[model samples]
Target chain A: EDVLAKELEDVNKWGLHVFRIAELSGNRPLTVIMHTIFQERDLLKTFKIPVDTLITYLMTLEDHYHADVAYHNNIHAADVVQSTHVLLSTPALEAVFTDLEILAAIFASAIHDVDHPGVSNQFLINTNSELALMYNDSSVLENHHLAVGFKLLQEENCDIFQNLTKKQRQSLRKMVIDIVLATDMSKHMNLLADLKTMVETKKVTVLLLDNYSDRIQVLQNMVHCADLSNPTKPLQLYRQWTDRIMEEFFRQGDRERERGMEISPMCDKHNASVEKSQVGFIDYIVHPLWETWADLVHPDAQDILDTLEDNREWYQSTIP
Target chain B: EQEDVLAKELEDVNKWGLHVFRIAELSGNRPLTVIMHTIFQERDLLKTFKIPVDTLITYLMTLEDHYHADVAYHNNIHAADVVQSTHVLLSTPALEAVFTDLEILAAIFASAIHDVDHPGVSNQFLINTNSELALMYNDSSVLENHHLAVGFKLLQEENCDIFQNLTKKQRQSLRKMVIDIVLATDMSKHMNLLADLKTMVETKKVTSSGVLLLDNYSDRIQVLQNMVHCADLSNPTKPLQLYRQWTDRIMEEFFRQGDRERERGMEISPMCDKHNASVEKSQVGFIDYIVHPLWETWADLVHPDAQDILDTLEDNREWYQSTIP
Candidate 1:
């Protein structure tokens, strides 16, 4: 218990230090969520949430994530939740979000990848997996996480919103659904485009809650950044994420090869260019996204952007 | 009031054309009994899967309790009617040896559990009110997702775990097939299911007599998805008397929702406003726009076997259309 408390001691600052909270919490989703939320947000008191109900829900959510997936498992869920907290506390965004908005964003991060089956959306569709068929092939995993996570909230013992009014519940549900659904990788370009325009057009300057459209767009981008925040973290921590994701991607590729399908890019174990892939990932996807994000918050995220560039250079230098 | 007589009625070739209202009167609270008997006893489901009969009975008991009798249309009788009709479709001579036994079992189970706890209101009503179910499902297949969620939750109960004896492999296959068929029951997927079915019938290879040469699991589950969907909307295909009763039941349920909407100062849904609703005209329109076209593809797929069912539906549509005047 003392050791876990010590591991979670960094629950506030080292969350962005991206410490080993997953193993420290025994890979239990509940501990990561419990320690983070109870210590950091006071989201429970703000929303009138019951501790046991939250625990029950998170425990169930944790079980649904396939622990077998090296990268998309509870650890990544833990990482995203931590990154979300870190990003929300970014200087310009300090106290900017309403209590409800903060709760929804954190909730979305925690369950965004719940029920991930250790495969990409394309892999599922290619294999004609039941999940692909269930969601009609559109944002299969995201739809599932939203549905599955919200369904858990329906159970009496797990209804954290038991004290929430009917209207509040509706607002929370809509907020959580939008943010979680935005995590679908398919929506990335559109999301980034919106985020860039908002930053360029000064929508982020007078960012008002007068219209929820503006508020939600900002929140969605925040969680999106959290979803892709790995490369911007400390290199030691970023390397851990790289190792895990490549293992998972290579595994899926191995499965594709076994099934007589084309190997998905970056999945072939024989062509292991880990550094090359990471560098390109930062250059093309991660850096572009974090750059616009940095401009939105300007000085607050300059350091994060600097970290991203530094990480990119390190990966670039190591490339064969 | 006799049990054998009701189960006997369910065993007839016209089982799909069942009088669900009358069967409920005859069976009292055990309307699902008729379905369970028809599937497990009349068929070899229990023995084949090594399922304990008592466990199934216990599960059915819980499932019946879960379904609200307060809901006029989506009560236990509707589930019985769906499974019975699904059984009838599976018996079609054209599909006689086409589907696997596991699939047949899954189809029956899916249909039986498809609307386990239906709220008896339209999905739009759930969406409009921001009802809990609609919220949970993100307004897509709201009730269907709940039904599957509740059904699987029931199965988790030790005594109610009817598939408990099956190996993980068998259980996974059953679970996967059940979700495929269950979610297809949602009307939003009706056209998608219909298109896939037509594509299969159009693309099917055949011998001199037109018997299908063979298939794969994609096509395997696709056909069953259409079958269960057909049975979900099969009320229109039943004998006129039975069809009329279902029409009355569903309309009454819709009107109740309309009453609630009025009480809440919300705009009443078009179909739910029974005061201005023309049941006959609506039925005709439903047949013309949706039902008739779907059954046409299905009748073609099953060949002459389903043409009588089609004729029955056309006849009913004609009667409704004529009554509209």
Candidate 2:
């Protein structure tokens, strides 16, 4: 645990490797999230939330993330939480956002993909899944994450927001819901378009974060960038994500074949062209998004953008 | 017997503002009779896809049942009306050979199921009150998403999947088209949809073979999206009697939502205050700002296909303008 504690001490850095922490902490990324909250923002003391209450809530949350989901497990959430933390810690954004917004971002990232079924939304809809039915086939996993995350607060000892006022809690839930919902992949184009607009308008006046919608819009994209930050990490770290995701998608393909359905875009292992898929993902989706996000934070995200470019080149080189 | 009369009435399915009310009265208010007539009339579609006639009837009936009778405006009859409008819109001469049979089938299917099971409230109202649907869709096109979701959900029932005989690629393609077209029916996307439609019209493309060269999915889906949207809001472009009925029903639906807001101590939505709202003025403004501009742009795309539609819409606008207090 001391080693886990020591690793988390370097947690605020953008290059903090979550895989290492996952290995050392026996896969309890939830603990890293807890330390992330405590170490970065002093949220526990700031909000007057009970330490035991936070732990009970985190414990319940970590357990809900299916350990068997190779890519979307607790470790991915932990990685996103650290990425979110680092995004907020940028000197450009320092003190610009409020404490409640920071708390909401951390909370949203921690629970964004909880209980992920390790399959795409299309898979769920095609298979007629209960989760798909529950959410009516839109943002099924993301909606489940927010609902389950909030529902745990109803438990006896797990009310982490118990000390907050009703309005405070309401605001937090709204931000969390909005942020988590933006992580749905189908909303990627829409999120980036708005982020581009925000970055564009920031040049006009001192109007950055001038309103609640603009402020929350920035945080929502922040979590989204972090959720999609895998390709923008160190090559070794990025490759780890690629390997695990390929395996998860291949398994999803396996199931799809067994169910006698058409294999989804990246799921079919045989025709996957994993390296090409990675490069195209970076070229089309990841690079455009990060390049725009880096424009917002300017100099702060240069290294992150460089890492993304480096990872894309490596994937490109590997592609036949 | 009655089928003979229904067939005679449904021949107007290609007419602008085809009277669903008359078809409803004659078809036991089911509207499936007209739907059946429209499908079989498209023999190319039936033979190309080899769609099951028995299943199509079953599916149409089931689809009709899903639309809530309680909803005043977005009910089954309005859906039937939209279907007829979509049929007329798709049959336009300029677009006659542009869309594939699959696309036409998808458009027809989309209009039928676009507003399935609506609860007669705005998506904002659903979000404000934390309706289960808002939570389900995360307030992103809440009703539109449900209509598409539930619309597809019903297809999974035994013998209910209308595209039952389609190849996987064809079925998936059609499903994708159906979802995109239906989700675009949300009014929140109106201006954005119209702007994209304008862009497509501005940069109209044609192949050497003199056919529309919608080389990308963006162009293809945008065209269908606007077509469905135009048909969805085509009440002003419809015949006067049908337009009046739509105006009355939609006002009632909006006022009902406003009444609920009052019950919740929330401010009334614009144009939803029954006593204060001017139906004539609201119609005039709707036509000027949203409807007429859209039909004009739509008319440009299909070159004279929407000429009558545009003329009728502007005439209706002038009538409403004169009637406004």
Candidate 3:
């Protein structure tokens, strides 16, 4: 409990060492971090929530996150949740949101990748996976993650929100679904475009304190930022995530080749040149989104943007 | 009708940077016929030496057929490329009178057959796998020895023996020069070969008339060796479009070997792993470490002769380096 307290405090201070928390919590990093955040926020006492029920739900939710996935497993969920906590704690953003909105943001981050099959949506569609068919080839994986997360909440002992009124439960579920769906990369351009328009208009809207649509948009962008925060972490931690994600990508490529399909770019292990792909990924994808997000958050995200540019330079220097 | 078309298509073989692939296409993939027909006609070797034209065509075509078509980079197309390169090198006005008809014949022939029947793998791959050819040649110039032996054997058939009209001394000299030149194309021999050429250029062994003074076997063969060697490695010296095409072909071949190595549970060779290879970076390294040094010495040996080629090499190297992220 004391280690949990210190780790949660550290999570709010600079950054949480998700790998260390994963180790300290015996690999139930999501449950430990979620429980710590819930207790720290006094959400259970304020909402008259049952403590055992919340614990059961968080543990069950963690169990649903596949451990075998390289980049989208429970450890990643813990990392994102910790990131959500950090973003909320930004000095410029302090007290910008109500406690209920904070709970939804944290919960959405934890469950955004539940039951991931360790493959991209494109792979799913190409392979004609059942999930792809079930979702009619539209946001296939994102919908599955939401379905699985909500499904787990229906189990009797794991119904953490059972004590809430039907209206409260409905509002909570809507917020979680809206925020999680926004994490789909297919939605990235539209989200960034909207955020840019808002920043250009100098709206500087208070995040969760705004109206329903405006507040949800803020939370959506917040979770999206947290999801892509891997490149903003300390160099060693960022490198670890890069290695894991690259392995996953190459494994998908291996599967494609096994099925007599053309290997995807940046996925062919023999031809990948990891450093170049990283440089490209950062330059074309990560940096653009982060740069926009930094402009939106202004001076608050300047440090993370610096780390990202530094990582890009490091990759550029290591090429053959 | 076909012979008429092939002759017309190959009329430009004397031109520098001839498109051998177009000739291969026009000749119905009979690169050997196109090359032999063009060389014998352009140099008037058959008329000058009184060789049987039909028999020479048969021998060269038979040699061309010996190249395995499925080998991506080391097939007849590449052989044709080298042969055209040899023709261009020998056609240099400054070095035109330095070589005899017989030496010219050997140089062209050596380039045409240097990579005949190549298995699309490196010699190190052969030796490591302990291939029978590796053992047959005792792992010493295994591919090159096979290329020379198979090439000469193809010439030994009754109707294919185009050199039957030559004197025995002429045949012996042609055979020796062809063997020396082909053997020198092996990358394992590159450093020593280049070193010898560098020293010859430094000492100004070339006569003031632009004639290389053939004081002995080493001097003569060194020039011929350097000539064919330059032709063999003229890929980067080609125009940018053609040079990039060659890079793609060789990278595919290298990646194929990498795939085989992976399937066999062996360590993948460098520049072979498709997943990790940086095509741009690898090209830059190859030009710097291998191509640049050899070509620099070669351009010096035949100053202003290979100057355009050296310029192209530098331009291609810069292009590849610019592509790096």
Comparison by DockQ, 2 against 3, better one: 2
Would candidate 2 be rated incorrect, acceptable, medium or high by CAPRI criteria?
A: acceptable
Computed on C-alpha atoms, the DockQ of candidate 3 is 0.00
True contacts kept of each: 0.24, 0.28, 0.00
Error of 1 at A295 (Å): 19
i-RMS, each model, one decimal: 5.4, 3.0, 29.6
Task: Give lDDT tens digits, candidate 2, residues B76-186.
Answer: 898888887888887776765778888888898899889999999999999878687776565678898889877888887778887888997787788778888988988
For model 2 chain A, where is the 10-residue window of minimal lDDT?
A201-210
Q: A17 in model 3: Cα distance from truth in Å? A: 82
Which candidate wins on TM-score?
2
DockQ values per model: 0.17, 0.32, 0.00
Give the candidates in order of lDDT, highest first: 2, 3, 1
Expressed as tens digits, the lDDT of each residue in A59-129 for candidate 3 is 99998888878888999998898888878776556787777788889889988999998888888867757
Q: Number of the top candidate by DockQ?
A: 2
Stretches of candidate 2 exceeding 4 Å from the true structure:
A1-28, A35-40, A44-57, A120-225, A228-250, A253-320, B1-4, B42-44, B205-216
lDDT of each: 0.80, 0.83, 0.81
